[PDB]
């Protein structure tokens, strides 16, 4: 259907920016979490 | 009073009559559905009634029977299936006889038929529909109107009603549609209606799709339809062909040669926009499914298995004809170009991008002569074509094979940067932005960097339609500077970079374009800030004072943010208000992650006050308030052990934070934020643990919330035990009983999404179980007596993972966190679990793939578990 999202730079919408920001946030949180878990458990 | 007068009135231009008629219709349908529907059907069945009144009755019956909202549709179906069968048959007959008596080109009774059948078929109260329609189609005496009305009704049927309920009666419907598809029909309207119907019905043609003779007859029918002089039939048959392509790629090899490709190229060669566009769409769908099949083939090759489906490189064989016509039609641009309307030119561009992705390196020789010749034409059309093609073909081949061309053409590109023609300037900006995004090695070139950078620097002052593109080009240059700087200057942090030498220059200009009055146009206001996040991120240690300076500027915007609470006048203004807060809230956490703790202390006080007020000012529109608390959380991730000064003015804010119970997104971060408090506040959250823990069970009790949140409550469960250590005894007995039910919950294997939903659900179960084990165990001393309270439950947990060990979906995370239990329990108990685990043999094979699992975190917990057993067996 309307595949305009691959045209020019139309693929930069506030919703897309929001979802990108939150997914980077969740990877950061996960990395900190298992980092702490790894240090406290064992090498 | 005459309901035909009501039907006439509900089409005349008068709001009062419209609303009054709608009220009467709804009131009488609710009060007496059967009699009202019978009267409506009888009235519309009369040929002598005015066509306007008949259309009004048809649309009203459609509205009563179907609507946009699925739940209203479902409840109306349940209301309708309760009507007595005599009136059901009466209205069935009335609507059945209505068709063929209307001069209107579309059948108003088609919608009514769709609506009634919507719940007739699932209850199977109308089994004569298929033979009735077959007889109507096959009747030689049938006129044009009757045939088209029947076809339109069948199309609406196959469009709206759930596909499963029509599975058994598909064969005769397909036979009727094919018999009505004969090209001998004198009216094109019947052909187009049948084409719409079949294209909307392809979702269940598999019943009759298997036969070779039926397939050949249907395809010959559609091929002959594609030769019809009427262009509407042309586009309908082309769309139908497109959907067959989207459905049945396996068999089209038997037929690509004879007819299909010739018709497609002929459609492309047409000067009419629609036919050419449909051709582009068909070949693009071919391209996309070739991508999907290439992905499947790659999976099969890495797995060693033979792929289910096999491709034959259709585009690889068609590009030799596809390239010249696509390139030629790329030049059909218009002076007054727009972006809200899809046009054949942008379709050609996106199709060329897809073909470039598919053919990899088999496009360069076939397009280089055109761009090479037409990059310098005096007319801007051919220069635009050349530059846009150069930008679009930028991907697909490896960068090494493209390096000489881009490095030898960059001076020409910066030449066309400066030409007065606006459109070519826009395309040039897009091309340089994409060239920086994809391959950075060519972007970094001091021989050209300074001139091009200066050029785009003054260019950003131009119209927004180029300002947004050049801003994203600046952002692209920013992450290119990162990627080539972390390898160039230092590892822990950049010290001084080439772009960073002019960093003070660019950053303030981005603030200038941020203040541009036309920022709303072409998302300029959201352009700079997103680019601002990344350019501030690339702050080499020499850029520290500069980023401190803009930090000194940003809170003024937030200080400004304090002071327009009275200027909310329109929803769009509120929307723009809402948009602005989201970016600004992300700005601090963007910059607060790259500052000094001491420099963060002074701004911490003012930040809290700004964040304190705005959480409550915008009580409505909680979407922005989602971004709030993680922005507050980011302070906790840096402030650390100095954040305790604000809990006394944070606990009510946390309480109202989880007091929504309606949106999962707000609580999604809320459960995260408290999970973040534990890693910072450590044991000081103990006095505050009582209030939240009590609140937490309330959200557990309420089942109205979504299912995706449920693992998250288990996420915070594990870590809070570590923060409070052995103090969890008071609430200890509560959680396992709550977790016992969720762990014991099980479902079949029908839907993948819920299969992965339980995957994260069980994943959360494991980590929560580790957290309580770790919290009760201590840090350095032996196993504390606080672990005895969960000892009787360990066997059941071992049984829970046993079922998970028998599961077949699997993922790296699931097995990895599974290994956490055995290592923790073995450290927790040791001898007590050795006999328990040996009762279950499937764990031994579960760890074998743990040694095989590619993920390092999977391996580490995998080796963590297995070595623990070895010392335990050798312990005695």
């Amino acid at each position: 259907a309307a595949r305009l999202h691959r045209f020019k730079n139309k693929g930069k919408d506030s919703t897309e920016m929001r979802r990108r920001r939150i997914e980077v946030n969740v990877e950061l949180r996960k990395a900190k979490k298992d980092d702490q878990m790894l240090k406290r458990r064992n090498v | 009073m005459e309901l035909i007068t009501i039907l006439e009135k509900t089409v005349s231009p008068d709001r009062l009559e419209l609303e009054a008629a709608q009220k009467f219709l709804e009131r009488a349908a609710v009060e007496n559905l059967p009699t009202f529907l019978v009267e409506l059907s009888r009235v519309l069945a009369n040929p002598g009634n005015s066509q306007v009144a008949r259309v009004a009755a048809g649309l009203q019956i459609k509205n009563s029977l179907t609507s946009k909202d699925p739940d209203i549709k479902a409840q109306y179906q349940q209301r309708w299936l309760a009507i007595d069968a005599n009136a059901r048959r009466e209205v069935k007959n009335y609507v059945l006889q209505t068709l063929g008596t209307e001069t209107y080109r579309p059948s108003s009774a088609s919608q009514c038929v769709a609506g009634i059948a919507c719940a007739e078929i699932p209850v199977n109260q109308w089994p004569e529909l298929i033979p009735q329609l077959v007889a109507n189609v096959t009747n030689p005496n049938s006129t044009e109107h009757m045939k088209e009305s029947t076809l339109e009704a069948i199309g609406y049927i196959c469009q709206d009603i759930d596909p499963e309920q029509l599975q058994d009666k598909s064969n005769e419907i397909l036979t009727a549609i094919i018999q009505g598809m004969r090209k001998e029909e004198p009216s094109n309207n019947v052909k187009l209606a049948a084409t719409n119907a079949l294209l909307n019905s392809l979702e269940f043609t598999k019943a009759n799709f298997d036969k070779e003779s039926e397939r050949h007859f249907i395809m010959q029918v559609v091929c002959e339809a594609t030769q019809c002089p009427d262009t509407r039939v042309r586009v309908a048959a082309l769309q139908n062909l497109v959907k067959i392509m989207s459905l049945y790629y396996q068999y089209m090899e038997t037929y690509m040669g004879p007819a299909l490709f010739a018709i497609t190229i002929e459609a492309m060669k047409s000067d009419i926009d629609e036919v050419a566009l449909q051709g582009i769409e068909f070949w693009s769908n071919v391209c996309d499914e070739e991508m999907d099949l290439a992905i499947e083939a790659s999976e099969a090759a890495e797995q060693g298995r033979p792929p289910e489906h096999t491709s034959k490189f259709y585009a690889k064989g068609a590009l030799q004809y596809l390239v010249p016509i696509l390139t030629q039609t790329l030049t059909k641009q218009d002076e007054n170009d727009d972006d809200d309307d899809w046009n054949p030119c942008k379709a050609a561009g996106v199709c060329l991008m897809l073909l470039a992705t598919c053919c990899e390196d088999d496009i360069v020789p076939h397009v280089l002569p055109f761009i090479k010749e037409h990059i310098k034409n005096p007319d801007w059309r051919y220069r635009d074509a050349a530059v846009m093609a150069f930008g679009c073909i930028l991907e697909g081949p490896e960068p090494s094979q493209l390096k000489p061309l881009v490095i030898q053409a960059m001076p020409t590109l910066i030449e066309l940067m400066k030409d007065p023609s606006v459109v070519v300037r826009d395309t040039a900006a897009w091309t340089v932005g994409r060239i920086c995004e994809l391959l950075p090695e060519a972007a970094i070139n001091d021989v050209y960097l300074a001139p091009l950078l200066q050029c785009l620097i003054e260019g950003l002052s131009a119209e927004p339609r180029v300002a947004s593109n050049v801003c994203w080009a600046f952002s692209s240059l920013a992450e290119a500077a990162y990627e080539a700087a972390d390898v160039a200057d230092d590892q822990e942090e950049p010290a001084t970079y080439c772009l960073s030498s002019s960093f003070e220059l660019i950053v303030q200009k981005l603030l200038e374009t941020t203040d541009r009055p036309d920022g709303h146009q072409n998302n300029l206001r959201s352009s700079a800030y997103e680019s601002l996040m990344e350019i501030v991120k690339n702050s080499a240690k020499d850029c520290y004072p500069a980023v401190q300076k803009t930090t000194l500027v940003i809170m003024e915007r937030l200080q400004q943010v304090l002071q327009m609470e009275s200027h909310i006048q329109s929803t769009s203004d509120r929307i723009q208000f809402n948009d602005l807060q989201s970016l600004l809230c992300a700005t601090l956490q963007n910059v607060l992650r790259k500052v000094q703790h001491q420099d963060a202390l002074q701004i911490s006080d003012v930040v809290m006050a700004s964040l304190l007020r705005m959480f409550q000012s915008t009580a409505g529109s909680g979407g922005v308030q989602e971004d709030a608390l993680m922005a507050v959380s980011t302070l906790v991730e840096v402030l650390g052990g100095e954040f305790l000064k604000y809990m006394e003015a944070f606990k009510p804010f946390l309480g109202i934070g989880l007091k929504n119970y309606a949106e999962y997104q707000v609580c999604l971060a809320a459960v995260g934020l408290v999970g973040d408090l534990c890693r910072a506040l450590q044991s000081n959250i103990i006095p505050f643990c009582d209030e939240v823990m009590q609140l937490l069970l309330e959200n557990l009790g309420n089942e109205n919330v979504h299912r995706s949140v449920k693992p998250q409550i288990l996420s915070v469960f594990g870590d809070i035990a570590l923060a409070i250590g052995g103090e969890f005894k008071k609430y200890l007995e509560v959680v396992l009983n709550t977790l016992q039910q969720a762990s014991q919950a099980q479902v079949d294997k029908s839907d993948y999404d819920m299969v992965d939903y339980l995957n994260e659900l069980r994943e959360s179960c494991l980590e929560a179980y580790t957290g309580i084990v770790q919290g009760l165990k201590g840090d350095q001393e032996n196993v504390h007596p606080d672990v005895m309270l969960v000892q009787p439950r360990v066997e059941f947990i071992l049984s829970f993972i046993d079922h998970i060990a028998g599961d077949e979906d699997h993922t790296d995370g699931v097995v990895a966190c599974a290994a956490g239990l055995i290592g923790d329990l073995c450290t927790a108990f040791g001898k007590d679990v050795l006999k328990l685990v040996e009762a279950r043999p499937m764990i031994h094979e579960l760890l074998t793939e743990g040694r095989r699992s590619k993920t390092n975190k999977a391996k580490t917990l995998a080796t963590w578990a297995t070595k623990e057993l070895r010392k335990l067996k050798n312990q005695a």
Side-chain angles (χ1 to χ4, degrees):
Chain A
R3 47 168 62 255
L4 199 45
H5 280 29
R6 322 288 312 292
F7 182 54
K8 275 318 323 313
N9 285 18
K10 294 252 211 173
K12 296 313 201 266
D13 293 28
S14 275
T15 83
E16 169 93 350
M17 315 336 307
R18 280 280 309 285
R19 68 169 300 297
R20 304 171 81 81
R21 252 91 54 90
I22 48 193
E23 52 67 19
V24 191
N25 236 16
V26 60
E27 335 307 337
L28 264 284
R29 174 191 320 310
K30 145 95 171 183
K32 174 73 50 67
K33 175 173 306 318
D34 44 8
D35 158 10
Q36 145 192 288
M37 197 303 321
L38 186 49
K39 333 172 283 219
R40 92 199 299 171
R41 179 196 308 254
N42 186 264
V43 47
Chain B
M1 182 285 318
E2 317 96 19
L3 70 155
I4 323 181
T5 318
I6 286 162
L7 307 171
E8 185 38 68
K9 282 289 187 180
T10 186
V11 200
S12 70
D14 209 346
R15 326 286 87 68
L16 174 85
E17 312 297 326
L18 285 155
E19 57 89 20
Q22 187 51 257
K23 175 252 158 190
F24 311 147
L25 291 151
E26 204 37 75
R27 186 260 330 149
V30 166
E31 175 54 48
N32 195 350
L33 201 46
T35 313
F36 203 22
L37 286 195
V38 159
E39 186 57 41
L40 267 286
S41 64
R42 177 198 296 103
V43 160
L44 55 93
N46 175 31
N49 286 347
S50 88
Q51 200 194 268
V52 157
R54 302 178 98 178
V55 175
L59 60 91
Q60 177 46 62
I61 289 198
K62 154 200 61 192
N63 304 319
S64 49
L65 270 162
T66 185
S67 173
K68 289 86 47 191
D69 208 357
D71 54 340
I72 311 179
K73 259 168 91 168
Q75 63 88 10
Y76 272 147
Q77 303 153 232
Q78 322 315 292
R79 195 169 92 178
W80 141 243
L81 49 74
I83 314 301
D84 37 0
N86 49 6
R88 296 199 271 190
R89 274 305 166 186
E90 182 56 82
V91 300
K92 281 176 237 175
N93 204 3
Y94 274 150
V95 186
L96 228 43
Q97 294 177 335
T98 308
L99 57 75
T101 70
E102 320 186 11
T103 72
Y104 200 25
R105 194 44 57 236
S107 158
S108 308
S110 283
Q111 316 247 22
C112 324
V113 152
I116 174 174
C118 267
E120 276 285 290
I121 330 303
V123 83
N124 274 290
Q125 200 72 43
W126 205 347
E128 62 94 23
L129 255 183
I130 308 86
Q132 153 73 210
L133 272 302
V134 160
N136 284 22
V137 166
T138 316
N139 198 309
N141 299 113
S142 296
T143 68
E144 210 207 71
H145 283 117
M146 194 294 328
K147 293 171 175 206
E148 57 89 11
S149 276
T150 48
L151 296 161
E152 182 178 295
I154 294 157
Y156 284 178
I157 291 294
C158 77
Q159 178 190 104
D160 168 324
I161 294 96
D162 162 79
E164 177 268 342
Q165 329 181 321
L166 295 312
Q167 278 277 315
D168 45 300
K169 320 143 297 294
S170 51
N171 38 355
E172 331 99 316
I173 303 176
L174 261 50
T175 315
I177 211 68
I178 298 315
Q179 191 56 253
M181 261 285 168
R182 305 313 306 122
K183 58 207 179 295
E184 294 90 332
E185 152 73 50
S187 166
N188 68 327
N189 320 124
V190 152
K191 306 154 160 175
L192 73 88
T195 320
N196 275 335
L198 44 57
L199 84 82
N200 263 240
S201 59
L202 325 185
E203 44 267 54
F204 40 70
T205 176
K206 37 198 82 42
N208 315 60
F209 165 76
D210 60 62
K211 174 66 197 95
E212 278 65 36
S213 162
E214 258 191 307
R215 218 154 35 222
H216 173 59
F217 190 42
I218 296 174
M219 273 196 347
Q220 208 185 91
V221 162
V222 306
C223 282
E224 290 141 355
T226 52
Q227 299 319 294
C228 163
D230 189 281
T231 203
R232 277 166 306 172
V233 156
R234 298 279 286 105
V235 317
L238 280 155
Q239 276 184 16
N240 153 25
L241 211 46
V242 157
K243 202 147 275 202
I244 329 305
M245 182 46 257
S246 76
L247 285 190
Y248 297 134
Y249 172 83
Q250 277 293 93
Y251 307 154
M252 306 345 300
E253 206 281 332
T254 319
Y255 330 100
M256 141 194 175
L260 278 299
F261 96 114
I263 312 158
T264 58
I265 306 151
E266 188 39 63
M268 255 165 221
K269 283 175 180 188
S270 147
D271 78 35
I272 329 176
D273 301 340
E274 272 71 11
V275 200
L277 170 54
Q278 297 303 324
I280 329 305
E281 202 56 279
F282 179 85
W283 275 114
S284 62
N285 265 25
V286 176
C287 202
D288 216 332
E289 275 185 355
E290 217 81 3
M291 266 323 147
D292 250 357
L293 198 40
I295 282 304
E296 147 160 332
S298 53
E299 309 322 288
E302 57 88 15
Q303 273 165 63
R305 50 160 302 272
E308 163 47 59
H309 327 97
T310 316
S311 152
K312 296 125 294 165
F313 318 104
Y314 285 43
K316 202 188 281 181
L319 61 83
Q320 47 141 324
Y321 305 90
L322 263 295
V323 168
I325 171 156
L326 260 302
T327 314
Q328 202 57 46
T329 195
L330 207 35
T331 74
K332 311 290 180 199
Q333 205 131 32
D334 51 294
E335 318 272 349
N336 194 4
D337 186 273
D338 217 337
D339 284 28
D340 52 359
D341 186 51
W342 181 283
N343 284 29
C345 275
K346 52 186 70 167
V350 297
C351 179
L352 193 34
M353 206 161 25
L354 271 309
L355 308 198
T357 53
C358 260
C359 85
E360 204 148 75
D361 215 351
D362 295 324
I363 178 141
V364 184
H366 315 71
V367 201
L368 67 88
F370 171 90
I371 42 152
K372 189 89 66 168
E373 196 271 332
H374 272 131
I375 207 172
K376 67 213 78 57
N377 174 285
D379 198 15
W380 58 268
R381 301 288 204 114
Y382 287 90
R383 267 186 279 96
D384 157 36
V387 64
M388 211 180 177
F390 179 56
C392 278
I393 68 142
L394 268 178
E395 52 194 50
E398 105 271 7
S400 98
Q401 212 143 346
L402 205 55
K403 275 163 183 179
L405 188 37
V406 288
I407 196 63
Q408 83 105 37
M410 171 36 48
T412 37
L413 309 175
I414 48 185
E415 295 318 307
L416 316 83
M417 172 56 257
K418 209 61 72 173
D419 52 59
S421 85
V422 185
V423 168
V424 152
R425 213 155 48 237
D426 190 15
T427 313
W430 186 83
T431 47
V432 57
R434 190 141 132 77
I435 212 162
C436 290
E437 259 178 44
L438 276 64
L439 71 173
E441 66 90 37
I444 72 137
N445 208 291
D446 193 28
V447 186
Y448 328 107
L449 259 168
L452 62 82
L453 165 68
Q454 183 51 253
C455 285
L456 45 86
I457 274 174
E458 323 102 342
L460 80 85
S461 316
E463 288 86 1
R465 97 159 280 171
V466 63
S468 280
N469 212 310
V470 67
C471 187
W472 253 273
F474 255 128
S475 68
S476 169
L477 209 65
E479 325 77 358
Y482 254 121
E483 199 283 342
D486 67 274
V487 199
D489 179 341
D490 204 60
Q491 71 296 329
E492 35 104 349
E493 262 315 279
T496 290
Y497 210 38
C498 48
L499 164 56
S500 309
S501 314
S502 281
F503 166 61
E504 36 207 38
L505 191 45
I506 42 185
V507 53
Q508 41 88 11
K509 272 319 199 176
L510 308 184
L511 275 304
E512 306 325 290
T513 200
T514 310
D515 314 334
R516 275 178 87 156
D518 38 356
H520 92 87
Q521 196 206 96
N522 292 267
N523 58 94
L524 257 193
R525 258 186 312 133
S526 53
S527 304
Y529 281 146
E530 150 66 19
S531 199
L532 186 50
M533 312 317 179
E534 179 55 273
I535 191 60
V536 180
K537 206 68 47 172
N538 219 14
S539 39
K541 306 168 206 79
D542 68 329
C543 318
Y544 284 173
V547 300
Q548 262 84 60
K549 293 146 193 157
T550 167
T551 325
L552 154 55
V553 184
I554 191 44
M555 161 304 299
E556 279 66 1
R557 318 293 269 246
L558 254 189
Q559 196 270 333
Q560 176 64 304
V561 167
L562 322 173
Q563 320 287 17
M564 78 322 302
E565 221 48 53
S566 68
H567 314 137
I568 297 100
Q569 308 309 307
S570 174
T571 307
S572 59
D573 314 350
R574 188 63 137 85
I575 282 165
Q576 290 149 162
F577 201 146
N578 293 307
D579 308 326
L580 201 38
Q581 299 158 277
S582 37
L583 326 170
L584 273 146
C585 290
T587 324
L588 309 111
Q589 54 110 13
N590 273 288
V591 304
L592 287 164
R593 210 162 300 110
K594 209 51 71 179
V595 292
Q596 191 72 15
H597 330 85
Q598 173 48 245
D599 216 332
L601 259 280
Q602 315 93 350
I603 42 159
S604 306
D605 192 9
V606 284
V607 155
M608 162 298 300
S610 308
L611 277 170
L612 186 132
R613 44 94 198 178
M614 58 42 61
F615 206 28
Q616 285 54 50
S617 60
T618 170
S621 179
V624 296
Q625 105 179 87
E626 300 155 10
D627 314 328
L629 59 173
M630 71 204 98
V632 201
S633 83
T634 36
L635 260 79
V636 196
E637 319 157 333
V638 48
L639 203 52
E642 282 73 9
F643 187 64
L644 295 90
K645 314 172 296 185
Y646 316 125
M647 334 322 303
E648 79 274 19
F650 205 9
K651 281 293 298 304
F653 290 114
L654 175 56
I656 188 192
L658 271 149
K659 260 158 213 164
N660 184 25
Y661 324 110
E663 170 50 67
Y664 51 88
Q665 283 147 353
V666 277
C667 92
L668 266 173
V671 303
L673 170 161
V674 49
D676 307 320
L677 306 188
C678 92
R679 309 181 222 102
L681 306 184
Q682 295 300 123
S683 66
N684 314 298
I685 203 58
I686 287 171
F688 315 108
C689 176
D690 311 299
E691 311 84 301
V692 53
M693 182 56 267
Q694 149 70 1
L695 167 61
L696 202 37
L697 304 179
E698 317 307 313
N699 328 103
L700 270 154
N702 184 279
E703 304 311 312
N704 320 118
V705 280
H706 191 229
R707 76 222 172 168
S708 48
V709 50
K710 185 150 202 177
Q712 305 285 67
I713 307 102
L714 329 182
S715 315
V716 47
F717 269 149
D719 48 48
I720 56 191
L722 271 161
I724 75 177
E727 310 324 296
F728 207 17
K729 292 168 301 199
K730 47 230 189 295
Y731 325 124
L732 192 132
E733 282 310 309
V734 189
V735 280
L736 318 95
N737 320 314
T738 60
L739 241 192
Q740 161 95 36
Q741 159 267 319
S743 57
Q744 285 300 88
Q746 281 276 39
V747 84
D748 68 357
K749 310 243 166 170
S750 45
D751 179 45
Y752 315 97
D753 321 63
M754 54 144 194
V755 166
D756 263 348
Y757 145 75
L758 57 92
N759 273 291
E760 71 196 50
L761 163 153
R762 58 194 49 199
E763 256 303 90
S764 45
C765 288
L766 325 181
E767 49 92 31
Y769 281 132
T770 40
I772 48 184
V773 166
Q774 300 279 20
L776 297 176
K777 172 171 313 190
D779 297 309
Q780 77 282 18
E781 212 34 66
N782 51 72
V783 278
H784 292 48
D786 304 281
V787 69
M788 308 339 308
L789 295 94
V790 288
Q791 196 273 334
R793 264 67 60 95
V794 312
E795 183 62 78
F796 153 70
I797 306 307
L798 224 43
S799 287
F800 177 42
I801 70 101
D802 196 334
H803 219 294
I804 306 150
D807 275 303
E808 263 322 286
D809 170 67
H810 279 175
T811 191
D812 271 312
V814 158
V815 284
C817 211
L821 292 324
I822 315 100
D824 249 346
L825 307 191
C826 282
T827 312
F829 288 169
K831 158 71 213 82
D832 320 320
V833 198
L834 282 151
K835 183 60 229 86
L836 275 37
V837 292
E838 289 158 332
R840 315 175 196 285
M842 71 295 307
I843 53 184
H844 307 330
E845 58 83 23
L846 200 65
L847 54 100
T848 53
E849 44 95 0
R851 306 315 155 290
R852 173 227 43 78
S853 322
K854 52 210 68 48
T855 292
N856 189 15
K857 97 216 185 298
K859 293 238 190 224
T860 40
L861 314 160
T863 59
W864 172 248
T866 170
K867 69 109 191 177
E868 197 139 0
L869 293 318
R870 310 294 174 285
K871 316 168 277 167
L872 292 190
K873 322 182 258 291
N874 314 311
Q875 178 180 358

